[PDB]
């Protein structure tokens, strides 16, 4: 099958980020999750303590040789990039990618679809150092879907994402770079405070033209942790069979029923299986003049 | 809830082995699964290159520190132990279960079930240092539940598991060396099927057997299924309608697997476990295979 996703990003023993965020959804959507764990940590970055071990390069390119030499690489028709927060995997990401792109073209098979979440911070917050940030603007050179928070598509443009005209410059900024469809999954709108707003942004390689896609999702209160790693994975699931508008709709859909039942931080993820795969209800994405 | 489980088993990006296979199914059935990853590695241990990180001891009291300074410990109804093969981290989780047990009783909880799993070998070979054998031994006197393949029973309690007789005289040692409940999840008429026993020590020893079909070829991850199924149903049944669904759970699976692709004379890859094709029947299991006490 095709359904076969090769998803970088962290594992925590305790609660719903990363790998533990991605995972079920892609699974109960049918896809194989081949994971490769950057960290395996006691929980996430927001409680008092955090331990436990982070992957070096060498760490990566030795797992990298045990999936090359069983002649596994040809299976992954996606690559989903999450929490790496490390400037020399960020970059041999690249690699790999290219490795895949290889394998998957000498045998034949579909491109294969590299999602790249460049997960760097959130709410004003960095959780990397700056070489980690020019490590995303090289990396983002090769994806063909990138999946940032406003933070993360302000500081790789250096362009203030606070409207749809400014989230409209971040994202030309990385279809420049070469990344052909952006997906910036919510910013608050001062003129429009109980809504949060989201652009899909689709540049045509060949025409040069951009197919631009806008809608809202009611603001919730409170702050959540892994809302981009459970959107990323479920834009994956849904993209497989869906034109990316739709796919990008059902995303939504999903992150506002798993919000509204956290509410009636943490993301009960296994909680909710039919609502991960049938949303109550799917966000408007609708095209732009 | 007391659905929560510690499970301290192996990480595999490719393949269905160790807490890849495990965590699925306890999820659909409602568990939050805390794993912690002994190995991370590329594949199991079958293809013909393995590579990866491996947990020192440090490494396994790095991540305890973590769990017990965020207050977690408590949660854990549930301990389940698969591949480890680090004979220093088998050891450490006698301390690892009894500071469960005692942060459970602090907070008013009922007791923590620890589900021992000791993953050793398979196909008469060895794949950990004969170290990690007697650590094993040790270990389950601590566990509440053990659930050997039957080269794992054999080795453990120096008993050739060949039948059922052989079989009993093994559980026997398992409930002498401390552990209560032993499934023995198969041995060999009649080469059509595989039997198993199910062995509850009061001093009495209630036991169970039962049978299910024997499909040709070598599947991994199985035991790791089951122990993972046997957890999910033992939460609300009996010991012997647990084990039933767990091995309907996994005629299943290997069915599904068998159906797309994964024969016998199949590759590695074919016969890795479907465990994404019916999750349905990962909870709803379309056989409960029957579990009939022994006289
Ligand atoms: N407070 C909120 N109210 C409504 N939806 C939210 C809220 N926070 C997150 N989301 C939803 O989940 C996704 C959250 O990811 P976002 O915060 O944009 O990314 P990240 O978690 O990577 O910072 C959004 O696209 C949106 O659907
Ligand atoms: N070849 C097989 N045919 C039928 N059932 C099997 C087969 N291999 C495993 N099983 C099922 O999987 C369960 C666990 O498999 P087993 O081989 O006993 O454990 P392990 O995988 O730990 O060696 C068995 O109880 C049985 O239900
Ligand atoms: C380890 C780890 N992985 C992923 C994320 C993003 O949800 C975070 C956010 O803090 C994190 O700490
Ligand atoms: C890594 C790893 N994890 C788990 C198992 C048992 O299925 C094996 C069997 O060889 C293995 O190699
Ligand atoms: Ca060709
Ligand atoms: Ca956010
Ligand atoms: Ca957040
Ligand atoms: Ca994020
Ligand atoms: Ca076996
Ligand atoms: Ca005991
Ligand atoms: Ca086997
Ligand atoms: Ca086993
Ligand atoms: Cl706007």
């Known amino acids: 099958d095709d359904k076969h996703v090769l998803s970088i990003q962290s594992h925590v023993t305790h609660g719903y980020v990363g790998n533990k965020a991605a995972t079920f959804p892609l ?154 469809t952006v997906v910036i999954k919510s910013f608050a709108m001062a003129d429009d405070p109980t809504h949060l707003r989201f652009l899909l942004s689709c540049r045509d390689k060949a025409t040069g033209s951009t197919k631009r896609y806008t809608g809202v999702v009611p603001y919730h209160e409170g702050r959540y942790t892994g809302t981009g790693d459970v959107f990323a994975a479920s834009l994956v699931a849904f993209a497989h069979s869906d034109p990316m508008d739709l796919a990008v709709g059902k995303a939504m859909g999903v992150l506002q029923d798993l919000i509204k039942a956290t509410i009636e931080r943490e993301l009960r993820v296994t909680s909710y299986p039919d609502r991960l795969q049938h949303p109550s209800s799917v966000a408007l994405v609708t095209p732009l003049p």
């Open 27 to 180: 699974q109960l959507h049918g896809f194989d999750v081949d994971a490769i764990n950057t960290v395996s940590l006691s929980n996430h970055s927001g409680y008092p303590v955090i331990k436990g071990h982070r992957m070096d390069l060498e760490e990566f390119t030795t797992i990298m040789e045990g999936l090359r030499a069983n002649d596994f690489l040809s299976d992954y028709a996606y690559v989903l990039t999450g929490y790496i927060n490390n400037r020399d995997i960020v970059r041999q990401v690249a690699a790999t990618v290219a490795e895949i792109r290889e394998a998957r073209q000498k045998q034949g098979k579909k491109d294969a679809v590299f999602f790249c979440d460049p997960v760097m911070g959130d709410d004003g917050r960095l959780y990397c150092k700056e070489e980690v940030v020019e490590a995303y603007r090289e990396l983002l050179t090769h994806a063909d879907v990138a999946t940032p928070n406003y933070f993360e598509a302000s500081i790789l443009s250096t362009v203030e994402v606070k409207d749809l005209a400014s989230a409209i410059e971040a994202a030309n900024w990385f279809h420049t770079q070469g990344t052909p």
